[PDB]
């Protein structure tokens with residue numbers, strides 16, 4: 001039971017609205033969601049297939065997403081992910097505040113900030 005569960009439907013709605021004909025932002029981002037300091041759920045934001053999917057807890061890579069495929073990963077509090085997803089804060093703001101850990105290409109999350117703004 002994550003706070004993030006409350007916004008997944010709306011995110012899926014936005015994904016469904018994305019134009020399929022001209023794809024340009026196609027990163028794979030791993031998201032490790034924390035509660036009380038521990039990772040309790042992991043999901044992939046797959047901008048190639050335009051889907052969010054739950055993956056094995058805290059895993060580094062999977063059959064579908066081997067290491068060489070993953071563009072970036074973030075470890076982030078459940079509530080903070082919810083705040084970004086509801087446009088109340090941004091990944092850049094969380095980085096400024098030292099609230100998240102990012103590996104791989106950090107600019108993928110900053111570009112996601114920009115692309116999510118008007119969606």
Ligand SMILES: CCCCCCCCCCCCCCCC(=O)O
Pocket residue numbers: 011012014015018022023024025026045047084085115116119
């Ligand atoms: C902050 C979490 C957001 C999770 C992503 C779900 C919201 C959908 C936003 C779609 C933005 C990506 C648009 C890509 C279009 C393109 O390929 O040019």
